[PDB]
Amino acid sequence: AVVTFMANLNIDDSKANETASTVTDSIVHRSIKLLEVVVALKDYFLSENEVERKKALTCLTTILAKTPKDHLSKNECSVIFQFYQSKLDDQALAKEVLEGFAALAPMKYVSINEIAQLLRLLLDNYQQGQHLASTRLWPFKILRKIFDRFFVNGSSTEQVKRINDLFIETFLHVANGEKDPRNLLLSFALNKSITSSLQ
C-alpha cells in the first residue's frame, strides 16, 4: 500500500517512464493491484484543477494498456463508468480518456451490450474532431484499434451488425477538415480496409 501511495505522490513530479515500469510490473506480478491503484487514484483527481486530473488519467491509461491480459469482467465493466462520467462532467481532458478507450479495448472480457454501449457513447456526447489537430487526430487512432480488434468480421456478423452501419457515419463524423498528411493516410488506409471488411 505504501508503494502505491509513494508512486502516486511521485507521479505528480512527472517521473515519466521511471514509475510507469514499476507500477506495470507490480500490477502484472500481483494481478490484484488494479483495485488498489484505482481506489488510490480516486481521490487523486478529485482536485478542481484539470492538470491533476489529466496527469492521473495519462498514467492510469498507460498502466491499463501495459496490462491487458488479465482483468476481471465485472471490474472491466466498472472501468467504463467513471470514464464516461468524466466525459460528461468535465471537458478539455477527453483526449486522455480516448487513449484510455484505446487501452481498454484489447481486453476481451467485454459483454455484447457493454461494447455496444461503448461504441454508441464514444461519438454521441463528445463529438470528437471539432477543432485542433490532436483532438481530430486521436479519433482516427481509437477507431483504428476498435476496427482492428473486434469490428473486423473475425466471427462473421452473428451479433455485431448493429455497429456496422453506424460506423460509417463516425468515420464521416471527423472528415472534410484534415489537412496534414498523416490523417490523410489514416483515412485512406481505414477506407481501403473497410471496403473489403465491411458488408
Side-chain angles (χ1 to χ4, degrees):
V2 289
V3 54
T4 61
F5 292 156
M6 61 79 71
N8 204 356
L9 290 176
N10 288 336
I11 185 64
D12 197 56
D13 295 331
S14 315
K15 293 209 299 191
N17 50 1
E18 209 280 334
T19 194
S21 78
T22 64
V23 174
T24 53
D25 288 326
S26 76
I27 290 169
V28 165
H29 299 149
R30 288 202 183 277
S31 180
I32 203 62
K33 278 279 187 182
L34 61 84
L35 273 162
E36 198 167 3
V37 298
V38 298
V39 301
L41 284 156
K42 204 61 61 192
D43 56 352
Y44 186 85
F45 64 91
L46 190 146
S47 173
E48 179 60 75
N49 50 2
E50 65 269 13
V51 181
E52 207 81 11
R53 295 151 161 174
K54 66 181 182 292
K55 287 328 189 72
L57 285 176
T58 177
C59 67
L60 176 62
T61 59
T62 304
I63 64 175
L64 275 175
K66 294 290 188 292
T67 318
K69 173 59 152 172
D70 181 58
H71 192 54
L72 181 71
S73 164
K74 186 61 65 177
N75 273 342
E76 186 273 337
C77 298
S78 70
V79 170
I80 297 89
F81 293 99
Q82 62 258 16
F83 283 126
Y84 65 92
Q85 287 85 19
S86 70
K87 292 315 204 323
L88 187 62
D89 304 324
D90 208 51
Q91 305 310 307
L93 76 166
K95 296 183 282 188
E96 287 81 356
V97 192
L98 294 174
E99 290 89 6
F101 275 137
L104 65 91
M107 187 66 204
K108 63 96 173 181
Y109 281 165
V110 187
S111 70
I112 55 170
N113 290 5
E114 184 68 32
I115 182 58
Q117 182 177 358
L118 290 173
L119 59 93
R120 285 306 295 115
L121 265 66
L122 64 88
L123 73 165
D124 276 347
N125 54 2
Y126 189 39
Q127 306 99 21
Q128 50 268 22
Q130 291 301 138
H131 200 268
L132 188 153
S134 191
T135 318
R136 82 186 80 182
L137 182 53
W138 301 111
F140 288 169
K141 270 75 176 176
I142 63 170
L143 64 92
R144 182 46 157 183
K145 276 74 70 177
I146 193 66
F147 174 26
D148 293 342
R149 174 190 58 102
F150 182 76
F151 181 51
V152 62
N153 286 345
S155 175
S156 181
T157 49
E158 83 283 26
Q159 64 97 22
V160 308
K161 56 181 73 64
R162 281 82 65 193
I163 180 181
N164 295 54
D165 56 357
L166 65 87
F167 195 97
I168 292 300
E169 44 269 56
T170 188
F171 182 76
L172 307 188
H173 182 74
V174 61
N176 309 109
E178 296 87 340
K179 312 306 163 202
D180 48 349
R182 187 267 183 276
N183 291 294
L184 294 174
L185 277 296
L186 269 159
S187 62
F188 297 160
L190 277 296
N191 171 347
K192 189 183 178 58
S193 53
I194 197 66
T195 53
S196 78
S197 71
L198 181 50
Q199 60 152 29

PDB file of all heavy atoms in Angstrom, residues 89-123:
ATOM      1  N   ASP A  89     -19.061  15.121 -17.106  1.00  0.00           N
ATOM      2  CA  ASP A  89     -18.948  16.198 -16.126  1.00  0.00           C
ATOM      3  C   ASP A  89     -17.912  17.239 -16.538  1.00  0.00           C
ATOM      4  O   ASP A  89     -18.152  18.444 -16.401  1.00  0.00           O
ATOM      5  CB  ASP A  89     -18.609  15.622 -14.751  1.00  0.00           C
ATOM      6  CG  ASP A  89     -19.611  14.580 -14.293  1.00  0.00           C
ATOM      7  OD1 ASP A  89     -20.814  14.744 -14.581  1.00  0.00           O
ATOM      8  OD2 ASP A  89     -19.194  13.598 -13.642  1.00  0.00           O
ATOM      9  N   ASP A  90     -16.761  16.802 -17.045  1.00  0.00           N
ATOM     10  CA  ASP A  90     -15.647  17.702 -17.306  1.00  0.00           C
ATOM     11  C   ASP A  90     -15.196  17.585 -18.755  1.00  0.00           C
ATOM     12  O   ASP A  90     -15.334  16.533 -19.385  1.00  0.00           O
ATOM     13  CB  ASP A  90     -14.466  17.413 -16.368  1.00  0.00           C
ATOM     14  CG  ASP A  90     -13.608  18.638 -16.115  1.00  0.00           C
ATOM     15  OD1 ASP A  90     -14.170  19.691 -15.749  1.00  0.00           O
ATOM     16  OD2 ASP A  90     -12.374  18.548 -16.278  1.00  0.00           O
ATOM     17  N   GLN A  91     -14.652  18.684 -19.274  1.00  0.00           N
ATOM     18  CA  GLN A  91     -14.151  18.763 -20.639  1.00  0.00           C
ATOM     19  C   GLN A  91     -12.695  19.216 -20.613  1.00  0.00           C
ATOM     20  O   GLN A  91     -12.100  19.410 -19.549  1.00  0.00           O
ATOM     21  CB  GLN A  91     -15.003  19.714 -21.490  1.00  0.00           C
ATOM     22  CG  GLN A  91     -16.485  19.379 -21.510  1.00  0.00           C
ATOM     23  CD  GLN A  91     -16.750  17.919 -21.822  1.00  0.00           C
ATOM     24  OE1 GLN A  91     -16.264  17.388 -22.821  1.00  0.00           O
ATOM     25  NE2 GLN A  91     -17.525  17.263 -20.967  1.00  0.00           N
ATOM     26  N   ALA A  92     -12.124  19.385 -21.808  1.00  0.00           N
ATOM     27  CA  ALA A  92     -10.743  19.791 -22.061  1.00  0.00           C
ATOM     28  C   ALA A  92      -9.726  18.745 -21.621  1.00  0.00           C
ATOM     29  O   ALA A  92      -8.528  19.052 -21.573  1.00  0.00           O
ATOM     30  CB  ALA A  92     -10.391  21.134 -21.401  1.00  0.00           C
ATOM     31  N   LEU A  93     -10.154  17.522 -21.300  1.00  0.00           N
ATOM     32  CA  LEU A  93      -9.240  16.442 -20.954  1.00  0.00           C
ATOM     33  C   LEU A  93      -9.665  15.118 -21.577  1.00  0.00           C
ATOM     34  O   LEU A  93      -9.152  14.064 -21.181  1.00  0.00           O
ATOM     35  CB  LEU A  93      -9.126  16.289 -19.429  1.00  0.00           C
ATOM     36  CG  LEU A  93     -10.263  15.613 -18.650  1.00  0.00           C
ATOM     37  CD1 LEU A  93      -9.799  15.266 -17.243  1.00  0.00           C
ATOM     38  CD2 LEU A  93     -11.524  16.457 -18.601  1.00  0.00           C
ATOM     39  N   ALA A  94     -10.579  15.147 -22.549  1.00  0.00           N
ATOM     40  CA  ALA A  94     -11.156  13.913 -23.069  1.00  0.00           C
ATOM     41  C   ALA A  94     -10.163  13.122 -23.911  1.00  0.00           C
ATOM     42  O   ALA A  94     -10.382  11.933 -24.166  1.00  0.00           O
ATOM     43  CB  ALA A  94     -12.408  14.228 -23.886  1.00  0.00           C
ATOM     44  N   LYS A  95      -9.076  13.756 -24.359  1.00  0.00           N
ATOM     45  CA  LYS A  95      -8.093  13.046 -25.172  1.00  0.00           C
ATOM     46  C   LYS A  95      -7.457  11.902 -24.391  1.00  0.00           C
ATOM     47  O   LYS A  95      -7.301  10.789 -24.911  1.00  0.00           O
ATOM     48  CB  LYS A  95      -7.025  14.020 -25.671  1.00  0.00           C
ATOM     49  CG  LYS A  95      -7.552  15.094 -26.609  1.00  0.00           C
ATOM     50  CD  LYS A  95      -6.429  15.985 -27.116  1.00  0.00           C
ATOM     51  CE  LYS A  95      -6.010  16.999 -26.064  1.00  0.00           C
ATOM     52  NZ  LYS A  95      -5.050  17.998 -26.609  1.00  0.00           N
ATOM     53  N   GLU A  96      -7.093  12.160 -23.131  1.00  0.00           N
ATOM     54  CA  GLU A  96      -6.511  11.113 -22.299  1.00  0.00           C
ATOM     55  C   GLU A  96      -7.477   9.950 -22.132  1.00  0.00           C
ATOM     56  O   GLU A  96      -7.072   8.783 -22.163  1.00  0.00           O
ATOM     57  CB  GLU A  96      -6.109  11.682 -20.937  1.00  0.00           C
ATOM     58  CG  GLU A  96      -4.871  12.569 -20.966  1.00  0.00           C
ATOM     59  CD  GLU A  96      -5.168  13.988 -21.418  1.00  0.00           C
ATOM     60  OE1 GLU A  96      -6.325  14.272 -21.790  1.00  0.00           O
ATOM     61  OE2 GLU A  96      -4.237  14.822 -21.400  1.00  0.00           O
ATOM     62  N   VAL A  97      -8.770  10.245 -21.982  1.00  0.00           N
ATOM     63  CA  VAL A  97      -9.746   9.169 -21.904  1.00  0.00           C
ATOM     64  C   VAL A  97      -9.927   8.498 -23.262  1.00  0.00           C
ATOM     65  O   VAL A  97     -10.369   7.348 -23.327  1.00  0.00           O
ATOM     66  CB  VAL A  97     -11.079   9.699 -21.344  1.00  0.00           C
ATOM     67  CG1 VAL A  97     -12.008   8.547 -20.990  1.00  0.00           C
ATOM     68  CG2 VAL A  97     -10.830  10.584 -20.131  1.00  0.00           C
ATOM     69  N   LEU A  98      -9.565   9.171 -24.358  1.00  0.00           N
ATOM     70  CA  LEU A  98      -9.551   8.500 -25.656  1.00  0.00           C
ATOM     71  C   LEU A  98      -8.443   7.453 -25.719  1.00  0.00           C
ATOM     72  O   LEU A  98      -8.670   6.319 -26.162  1.00  0.00           O
ATOM     73  CB  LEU A  98      -9.399   9.519 -26.787  1.00  0.00           C
ATOM     74  CG  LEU A  98     -10.547  10.505 -27.004  1.00  0.00           C
ATOM     75  CD1 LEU A  98     -10.180  11.530 -28.066  1.00  0.00           C
ATOM     76  CD2 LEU A  98     -11.823   9.770 -27.383  1.00  0.00           C
ATOM     77  N   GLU A  99      -7.228   7.812 -25.281  1.00  0.00           N
ATOM     78  CA  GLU A  99      -6.213   6.762 -25.161  1.00  0.00           C
ATOM     79  C   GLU A  99      -6.629   5.707 -24.143  1.00  0.00           C
ATOM     80  O   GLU A  99      -6.246   4.541 -24.271  1.00  0.00           O
ATOM     81  CB  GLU A  99      -4.807   7.273 -24.805  1.00  0.00           C
ATOM     82  CG  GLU A  99      -4.055   8.060 -25.880  1.00  0.00           C
ATOM     83  CD  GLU A  99      -4.322   9.537 -25.850  1.00  0.00           C
ATOM     84  OE1 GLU A  99      -5.008   9.977 -24.918  1.00  0.00           O
ATOM     85  OE2 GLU A  99      -3.844  10.256 -26.750  1.00  0.00           O
ATOM     86  N   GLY A 100      -7.417   6.088 -23.139  1.00  0.00           N
ATOM     87  CA  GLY A 100      -7.935   5.097 -22.207  1.00  0.00           C
ATOM     88  C   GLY A 100      -8.870   4.102 -22.866  1.00  0.00           C
ATOM     89  O   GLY A 100      -8.813   2.904 -22.588  1.00  0.00           O
ATOM     90  N   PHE A 101      -9.757   4.592 -23.733  1.00  0.00           N
ATOM     91  CA  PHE A 101     -10.618   3.700 -24.503  1.00  0.00           C
ATOM     92  C   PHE A 101      -9.790   2.797 -25.406  1.00  0.00           C
ATOM     93  O   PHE A 101     -10.061   1.595 -25.517  1.00  0.00           O
ATOM     94  CB  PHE A 101     -11.614   4.509 -25.332  1.00  0.00           C
ATOM     95  CG  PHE A 101     -12.854   4.897 -24.582  1.00  0.00           C
ATOM     96  CD1 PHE A 101     -13.382   6.171 -24.702  1.00  0.00           C
ATOM     97  CD2 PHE A 101     -13.501   3.984 -23.766  1.00  0.00           C
ATOM     98  CE1 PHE A 101     -14.527   6.529 -24.018  1.00  0.00           C
ATOM     99  CE2 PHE A 101     -14.643   4.339 -23.076  1.00  0.00           C
ATOM    100  CZ  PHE A 101     -15.158   5.612 -23.203  1.00  0.00           C
ATOM    101  N   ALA A 102      -8.772   3.364 -26.059  1.00  0.00           N
ATOM    102  CA  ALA A 102      -7.897   2.558 -26.907  1.00  0.00           C
ATOM    103  C   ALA A 102      -7.170   1.491 -26.094  1.00  0.00           C
ATOM    104  O   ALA A 102      -6.905   0.392 -26.594  1.00  0.00           O
ATOM    105  CB  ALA A 102      -6.897   3.456 -27.634  1.00  0.00           C
ATOM    106  N   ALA A 103      -6.829   1.806 -24.843  1.00  0.00           N
ATOM    107  CA  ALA A 103      -6.124   0.856 -23.989  1.00  0.00           C
ATOM    108  C   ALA A 103      -7.048  -0.231 -23.454  1.00  0.00           C
ATOM    109  O   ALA A 103      -6.633  -1.389 -23.332  1.00  0.00           O
ATOM    110  CB  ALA A 103      -5.459   1.595 -22.830  1.00  0.00           C
ATOM    111  N   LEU A 104      -8.287   0.122 -23.107  1.00  0.00           N
ATOM    112  CA  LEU A 104      -9.209  -0.863 -22.552  1.00  0.00           C
ATOM    113  C   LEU A 104      -9.898  -1.676 -23.638  1.00  0.00           C
ATOM    114  O   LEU A 104     -10.529  -2.695 -23.334  1.00  0.00           O
ATOM    115  CB  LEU A 104     -10.250  -0.178 -21.660  1.00  0.00           C
ATOM    116  CG  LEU A 104     -11.266   0.795 -22.271  1.00  0.00           C
ATOM    117  CD1 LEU A 104     -12.550   0.087 -22.690  1.00  0.00           C
ATOM    118  CD2 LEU A 104     -11.577   1.918 -21.292  1.00  0.00           C
ATOM    119  N   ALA A 105      -9.803  -1.241 -24.895  1.00  0.00           N
ATOM    120  CA  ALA A 105     -10.406  -2.004 -25.986  1.00  0.00           C
ATOM    121  C   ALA A 105      -9.846  -3.418 -26.107  1.00  0.00           C
ATOM    122  O   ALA A 105     -10.648  -4.365 -26.166  1.00  0.00           O
ATOM    123  CB  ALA A 105     -10.264  -1.226 -27.299  1.00  0.00           C
ATOM    124  N   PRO A 106      -8.505  -3.650 -26.118  1.00  0.00           N
ATOM    125  CA  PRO A 106      -8.000  -5.011 -26.367  1.00  0.00           C
ATOM    126  C   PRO A 106      -8.466  -6.053 -25.360  1.00  0.00           C
ATOM    127  O   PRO A 106      -8.380  -7.254 -25.635  1.00  0.00           O
ATOM    128  CB  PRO A 106      -6.477  -4.835 -26.307  1.00  0.00           C
ATOM    129  CG  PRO A 106      -6.250  -3.425 -26.667  1.00  0.00           C
ATOM    130  CD  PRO A 106      -7.401  -2.674 -26.075  1.00  0.00           C
ATOM    131  N   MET A 107      -8.940  -5.617 -24.195  1.00  0.00           N
ATOM    132  CA  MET A 107      -9.484  -6.553 -23.219  1.00  0.00           C
ATOM    133  C   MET A 107     -10.667  -7.300 -23.822  1.00  0.00           C
ATOM    134  O   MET A 107     -11.558  -6.691 -24.421  1.00  0.00           O
ATOM    135  CB  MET A 107      -9.908  -5.815 -21.952  1.00  0.00           C
ATOM    136  CG  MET A 107     -10.337  -6.740 -20.831  1.00  0.00           C
ATOM    137  SD  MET A 107      -8.950  -7.729 -20.241  1.00  0.00           S
ATOM    138  CE  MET A 107      -9.805  -9.131 -19.532  1.00  0.00           C
ATOM    139  N   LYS A 108     -10.675  -8.624 -23.667  1.00  0.00           N
ATOM    140  CA  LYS A 108     -11.673  -9.465 -24.315  1.00  0.00           C
ATOM    141  C   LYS A 108     -12.770  -9.950 -23.374  1.00  0.00           C
ATOM    142  O   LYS A 108     -13.644 -10.706 -23.812  1.00  0.00           O
ATOM    143  CB  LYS A 108     -10.988 -10.659 -25.000  1.00  0.00           C
ATOM    144  CG  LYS A 108     -10.256 -11.629 -24.080  1.00  0.00           C
ATOM    145  CD  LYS A 108     -11.112 -12.830 -23.707  1.00  0.00           C
ATOM    146  CE  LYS A 108     -10.301 -13.861 -22.939  1.00  0.00           C
ATOM    147  NZ  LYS A 108     -11.108 -15.061 -22.587  1.00  0.00           N
ATOM    148  N   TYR A 109     -12.752  -9.540 -22.104  1.00  0.00           N
ATOM    149  CA  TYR A 109     -13.867  -9.799 -21.193  1.00  0.00           C
ATOM    150  C   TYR A 109     -14.891  -8.664 -21.269  1.00  0.00           C
ATOM    151  O   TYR A 109     -15.161  -7.952 -20.303  1.00  0.00           O
ATOM    152  CB  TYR A 109     -13.363  -9.994 -19.768  1.00  0.00           C
ATOM    153  CG  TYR A 109     -12.776 -11.360 -19.495  1.00  0.00           C
ATOM    154  CD1 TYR A 109     -12.007 -11.592 -18.363  1.00  0.00           C
ATOM    155  CD2 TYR A 109     -13.005 -12.421 -20.360  1.00  0.00           C
ATOM    156  CE1 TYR A 109     -11.471 -12.840 -18.106  1.00  0.00           C
ATOM    157  CE2 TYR A 109     -12.475 -13.672 -20.110  1.00  0.00           C
ATOM    158  CZ  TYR A 109     -11.708 -13.875 -18.983  1.00  0.00           C
ATOM    159  OH  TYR A 109     -11.178 -15.120 -18.730  1.00  0.00           O
ATOM    160  N   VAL A 110     -15.467  -8.508 -22.459  1.00  0.00           N
ATOM    161  CA  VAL A 110     -16.464  -7.478 -22.732  1.00  0.00           C
ATOM    162  C   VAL A 110     -17.738  -8.162 -23.200  1.00  0.00           C
ATOM    163  O   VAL A 110     -17.703  -8.994 -24.114  1.00  0.00           O
ATOM    164  CB  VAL A 110     -15.969  -6.469 -23.784  1.00  0.00           C
ATOM    165  CG1 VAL A 110     -16.949  -5.313 -23.911  1.00  0.00           C
ATOM    166  CG2 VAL A 110     -14.581  -5.961 -23.425  1.00  0.00           C
ATOM    167  N   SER A 111     -18.859  -7.812 -22.576  1.00  0.00           N
ATOM    168  CA  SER A 111     -20.140  -8.382 -22.954  1.00  0.00           C
ATOM    169  C   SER A 111     -20.622  -7.784 -24.274  1.00  0.00           C
ATOM    170  O   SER A 111     -20.075  -6.802 -24.783  1.00  0.00           O
ATOM    171  CB  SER A 111     -21.176  -8.155 -21.852  1.00  0.00           C
ATOM    172  OG  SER A 111     -21.535  -6.788 -21.761  1.00  0.00           O
ATOM    173  N   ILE A 112     -21.665  -8.399 -24.833  1.00  0.00           N
ATOM    174  CA  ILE A 112     -22.193  -7.952 -26.120  1.00  0.00           C
ATOM    175  C   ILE A 112     -22.794  -6.556 -26.000  1.00  0.00           C
ATOM    176  O   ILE A 112     -22.717  -5.750 -26.935  1.00  0.00           O
ATOM    177  CB  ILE A 112     -23.214  -8.971 -26.662  1.00  0.00           C
ATOM    178  CG1 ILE A 112     -24.318  -9.232 -25.635  1.00  0.00           C
ATOM    179  CG2 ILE A 112     -22.519 -10.273 -27.028  1.00  0.00           C
ATOM    180  CD1 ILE A 112     -25.477 -10.040 -26.177  1.00  0.00           C
ATOM    181  N   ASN A 113     -23.406  -6.250 -24.856  1.00  0.00           N
ATOM    182  CA  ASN A 113     -24.019  -4.945 -24.650  1.00  0.00           C
ATOM    183  C   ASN A 113     -23.026  -3.881 -24.203  1.00  0.00           C
ATOM    184  O   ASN A 113     -23.206  -2.703 -24.535  1.00  0.00           O
ATOM    185  CB  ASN A 113     -25.148  -5.049 -23.620  1.00  0.00           C
ATOM    186  CG  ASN A 113     -26.352  -5.801 -24.151  1.00  0.00           C
ATOM    187  OD1 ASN A 113     -26.325  -6.337 -25.259  1.00  0.00           O
ATOM    188  ND2 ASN A 113     -27.419  -5.843 -23.361  1.00  0.00           N
ATOM    189  N   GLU A 114     -21.990  -4.262 -23.451  1.00  0.00           N
ATOM    190  CA  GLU A 114     -21.032  -3.276 -22.961  1.00  0.00           C
ATOM    191  C   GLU A 114     -20.260  -2.642 -24.113  1.00  0.00           C
ATOM    192  O   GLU A 114     -20.052  -1.422 -24.143  1.00  0.00           O
ATOM    193  CB  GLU A 114     -20.075  -3.924 -21.961  1.00  0.00           C
ATOM    194  CG  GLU A 114     -19.108  -2.943 -21.322  1.00  0.00           C
ATOM    195  CD  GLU A 114     -19.812  -1.972 -20.394  1.00  0.00           C
ATOM    196  OE1 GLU A 114     -20.818  -2.368 -19.770  1.00  0.00           O
ATOM    197  OE2 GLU A 114     -19.367  -0.809 -20.296  1.00  0.00           O
ATOM    198  N   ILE A 115     -19.830  -3.459 -25.077  1.00  0.00           N
ATOM    199  CA  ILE A 115     -19.160  -2.920 -26.258  1.00  0.00           C
ATOM    200  C   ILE A 115     -20.131  -2.074 -27.074  1.00  0.00           C
ATOM    201  O   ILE A 115     -19.744  -1.062 -27.671  1.00  0.00           O
ATOM    202  CB  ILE A 115     -18.541  -4.057 -27.094  1.00  0.00           C
ATOM    203  CG1 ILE A 115     -17.795  -3.494 -28.307  1.00  0.00           C
ATOM    204  CG2 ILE A 115     -19.599  -5.064 -27.525  1.00  0.00           C
ATOM    205  CD1 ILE A 115     -16.696  -2.516 -27.951  1.00  0.00           C
ATOM    206  N   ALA A 116     -21.406  -2.471 -27.105  1.00  0.00           N
ATOM    207  CA  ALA A 116     -22.419  -1.664 -27.777  1.00  0.00           C
ATOM    208  C   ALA A 116     -22.562  -0.303 -27.108  1.00  0.00           C
ATOM    209  O   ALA A 116     -22.650   0.729 -27.783  1.00  0.00           O
ATOM    210  CB  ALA A 116     -23.756  -2.405 -27.795  1.00  0.00           C
ATOM    211  N   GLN A 117     -22.577  -0.284 -25.772  1.00  0.00           N
ATOM    212  CA  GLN A 117     -22.645   0.985 -25.055  1.00  0.00           C
ATOM    213  C   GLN A 117     -21.415   1.839 -25.336  1.00  0.00           C
ATOM    214  O   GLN A 117     -21.527   3.054 -25.527  1.00  0.00           O
ATOM    215  CB  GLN A 117     -22.796   0.732 -23.555  1.00  0.00           C
ATOM    216  CG  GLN A 117     -22.914   1.997 -22.715  1.00  0.00           C
ATOM    217  CD  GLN A 117     -23.144   1.699 -21.244  1.00  0.00           C
ATOM    218  OE1 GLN A 117     -23.245   0.540 -20.843  1.00  0.00           O
ATOM    219  NE2 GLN A 117     -23.226   2.748 -20.433  1.00  0.00           N
ATOM    220  N   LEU A 118     -20.234   1.216 -25.369  1.00  0.00           N
ATOM    221  CA  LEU A 118     -19.013   1.944 -25.707  1.00  0.00           C
ATOM    222  C   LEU A 118     -19.118   2.591 -27.083  1.00  0.00           C
ATOM    223  O   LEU A 118     -18.880   3.797 -27.237  1.00  0.00           O
ATOM    224  CB  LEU A 118     -17.812   0.999 -25.665  1.00  0.00           C
ATOM    225  CG  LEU A 118     -17.363   0.486 -24.302  1.00  0.00           C
ATOM    226  CD1 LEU A 118     -16.286  -0.572 -24.462  1.00  0.00           C
ATOM    227  CD2 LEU A 118     -16.838   1.656 -23.509  1.00  0.00           C
ATOM    228  N   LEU A 119     -19.476   1.799 -28.096  1.00  0.00           N
ATOM    229  CA  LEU A 119     -19.490   2.318 -29.459  1.00  0.00           C
ATOM    230  C   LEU A 119     -20.587   3.356 -29.652  1.00  0.00           C
ATOM    231  O   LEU A 119     -20.438   4.265 -30.475  1.00  0.00           O
ATOM    232  CB  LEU A 119     -19.642   1.177 -30.469  1.00  0.00           C
ATOM    233  CG  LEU A 119     -20.869   0.266 -30.418  1.00  0.00           C
ATOM    234  CD1 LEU A 119     -21.975   0.774 -31.336  1.00  0.00           C
ATOM    235  CD2 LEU A 119     -20.488  -1.161 -30.778  1.00  0.00           C
ATOM    236  N   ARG A 120     -21.693   3.241 -28.913  1.00  0.00           N
ATOM    237  CA  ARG A 120     -22.744   4.249 -29.015  1.00  0.00           C
ATOM    238  C   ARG A 120     -22.344   5.547 -28.323  1.00  0.00           C
ATOM    239  O   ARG A 120     -22.591   6.638 -28.848  1.00  0.00           O
ATOM    240  CB  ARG A 120     -24.050   3.709 -28.432  1.00  0.00           C
ATOM    241  CG  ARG A 120     -24.754   2.700 -29.322  1.00  0.00           C
ATOM    242  CD  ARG A 120     -24.986   3.270 -30.714  1.00  0.00           C
ATOM    243  NE  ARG A 120     -25.896   4.408 -30.690  1.00  0.00           N
ATOM    244  CZ  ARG A 120     -25.554   5.649 -31.010  1.00  0.00           C
ATOM    245  NH1 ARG A 120     -24.324   5.948 -31.398  1.00  0.00           N
ATOM    246  NH2 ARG A 120     -26.466   6.613 -30.937  1.00  0.00           N
ATOM    247  N   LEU A 121     -21.727   5.451 -27.144  1.00  0.00           N
ATOM    248  CA  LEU A 121     -21.433   6.641 -26.356  1.00  0.00           C
ATOM    249  C   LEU A 121     -20.209   7.396 -26.858  1.00  0.00           C
ATOM    250  O   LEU A 121     -20.132   8.616 -26.677  1.00  0.00           O
ATOM    251  CB  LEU A 121     -21.242   6.258 -24.887  1.00  0.00           C
ATOM    252  CG  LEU A 121     -22.466   6.388 -23.975  1.00  0.00           C
ATOM    253  CD1 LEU A 121     -23.551   5.394 -24.364  1.00  0.00           C
ATOM    254  CD2 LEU A 121     -22.073   6.211 -22.514  1.00  0.00           C
ATOM    255  N   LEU A 122     -19.246   6.704 -27.477  1.00  0.00           N
ATOM    256  CA  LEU A 122     -17.959   7.341 -27.751  1.00  0.00           C
ATOM    257  C   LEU A 122     -18.077   8.516 -28.718  1.00  0.00           C
ATOM    258  O   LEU A 122     -17.257   9.440 -28.663  1.00  0.00           O
ATOM    259  CB  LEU A 122     -16.951   6.314 -28.276  1.00  0.00           C
ATOM    260  CG  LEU A 122     -17.151   5.579 -29.602  1.00  0.00           C
ATOM    261  CD1 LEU A 122     -16.562   6.361 -30.764  1.00  0.00           C
ATOM    262  CD2 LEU A 122     -16.493   4.216 -29.514  1.00  0.00           C
ATOM    263  N   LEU A 123     -19.073   8.514 -29.608  1.00  0.00           N
ATOM    264  CA  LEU A 123     -19.201   9.605 -30.570  1.00  0.00           C
ATOM    265  C   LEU A 123     -20.355  10.550 -30.267  1.00  0.00           C
ATOM    266  O   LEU A 123     -20.408  11.640 -30.849  1.00  0.00           O
ATOM    267  CB  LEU A 123     -19.403   9.076 -31.996  1.00  0.00           C
ATOM    268  CG  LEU A 123     -20.766   8.467 -32.355  1.00  0.00           C
ATOM    269  CD1 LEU A 123     -20.910   8.352 -33.865  1.00  0.00           C
ATOM    270  CD2 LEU A 123     -20.999   7.116 -31.700  1.00  0.00           C
TER     271      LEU A 123
END
